[PDB]
Structure 1
């Protein structure tokens, strides 16, 4: 049928427009945005704390600084590095040489279906053990805060402060699982899938949002400082968006042609 594509708006047609025929029945509605995104998926894998921690310093950190790495996980589909927001995803193709290796993460499915510009939704978290018959706990604090770092002495046994606080802490039995849901607590109204502004008024890095996440999570062993074991331990984190919404179209990744 004759038409002009330069106008931008083109009306969708059917088989009957130019030939003899008829339209098909609806079928099913599995493409609904709310129904599509309510499925759990892996996000990151982190270690388990066995003592009081030292939060990593900002990125301009030079050598020789003492801190703990790979113990904290951010809750956000965007790329991150060293437990802090980033802009470019990383990958170590040559595990050799000096220097500490930076943790990295990303939400492959979310960015494979990230066809829009802005997003908002609640979020449900779950954790799972990767070691046989392990006892652990999980802690959390909201966006725009920091982790207290010190300990107290009870009966000559040091006890880290992160045991107590008015922000959720949860315990699981031998081989159990931890589950709960969180609200949308960032100051911004919506989470930007892609951004092009600056946060600070000067010396800022363009395109790096400040508070595009839900919070922060970590795991620890409920024992005093006197029982620091000899082997490292790991856990896995699962997230699941709930009651999602989208606001403005965009484009999808570039599938390279061999």
Structure 2
């Protein structure tokens, strides 16, 4: 083989993270900082890049809840350990293959998507005493479970930016200029929901995960890789 061919190397799928199953039109989490009483639906808006992230929004540092208890709500993040440990280069661009992975056995579900930086708004309407979240139809595709199913698909590069910086040193905004945050470097967000009306909201709890694969990439310039503590 010629494994060292990078283009060939990374073209395989891997887990992104889990999200909770949806059962109604949802309140998108508010921009930070967020205060108690501003109730919002965290843990369903699945961001679409293995960068450090938090509560369906990007992140720069890495912090995790090493402790099991405390005050407030537990957020969630996402890191691709394999690629990020193998990413000794600077700029990047590629396409993205992805496939559904249901955690609950025997599940019936429906899923949707919207692209990078695409704002969300669903609301719902009553079909004969039954609310119909508008997202049941809309601008973007959808796919469904055959009482369970391996839904698969691919998406292209979408950002106005020419390329993806592997690690970054610019400033995000003219105000609150967050260093290390290139915003327009992902593919958007998806969402999995039951094909039932809001009235049919159930007590049962369900979860789903996803695997992601890199397609036809391009890489530039060197970059460092983590050191190991000698103990």
TM-score range, shorter chain: over 0.9
- Contact kept, 8 Å, 1:54 with 1:149, in 2: the verdict is no
- Contact kept, 8 Å, 1:42 with 1:236, in 2: the verdict is yes
Paired with 1:246 and 1:186, the residues of 2 have a C-alpha distance of: 17
Which residue does 2:82 correspond to in 1? 109
- Contact kept, 8 Å, 1:81 with 1:102, in 2: the verdict is yes
- Runs of 4+ residues over 2 Å off in structure 1: none
Compare CA radii of gyration and give the structure with the larger one: 1
- Contact kept, 8 Å, 2:107 with 2:145, in 1: the verdict is no
Give 1:64 deviation, angstroms: 1.2
Give 1:254 deviation, angstroms: 1.4
Paired with 1:30 and 1:208, the residues of 2 have a C-alpha distance of: 32
Which blocks of at least 5 consecutive residues in structure 1 are unaligned? 1-27
- Normalising by structure 1, we get a TM-score of 0.87
Give 1:255 deviation, angstroms: 1.4
- Contact kept, 8 Å, 1:77 with 1:110, in 2: the verdict is no
1:99-122 CA-partner distances (Å, limit 9, x unpaired): 101111111011110110111100
1:22-56 CA-partner distances (Å, limit 9, x unpaired): xxxxxx31110011000111111111100110000
Give 1:142 deviation, angstroms: 0.7
Give 1:159 deviation, angstroms: 0.7
- Contact kept, 8 Å, 1:78 with 1:193, in 2: the verdict is no
Which blocks of at least 5 consecutive residues in structure 2 are unaligned? none
Secondary structure (helix, strand or coil) at the match of 1:219 reads: strand
State the structure with bigger RCO (CA 8 A, min sep 6), 1 or 2: 2
Give 1:61 deviation, angstroms: 1.4
Paired with 1:132 and 1:201, the residues of 2 have a C-alpha distance of: 48
- Contact kept, 8 Å, 1:114 with 1:252, in 2: the verdict is yes
Give 1:235 deviation, angstroms: 0.6
Give 1:225 deviation, angstroms: 0.7
Matches within 5 A, 1:38-57: 38-57=11-30
Aligned residues: 231
- Contact kept, 8 Å, 1:47 with 1:233, in 2: the verdict is yes
Give 1:166 deviation, angstroms: 2.2
- Superposed CA RMSD in Å reads 1.0
Give 1:62 deviation, angstroms: 1.7
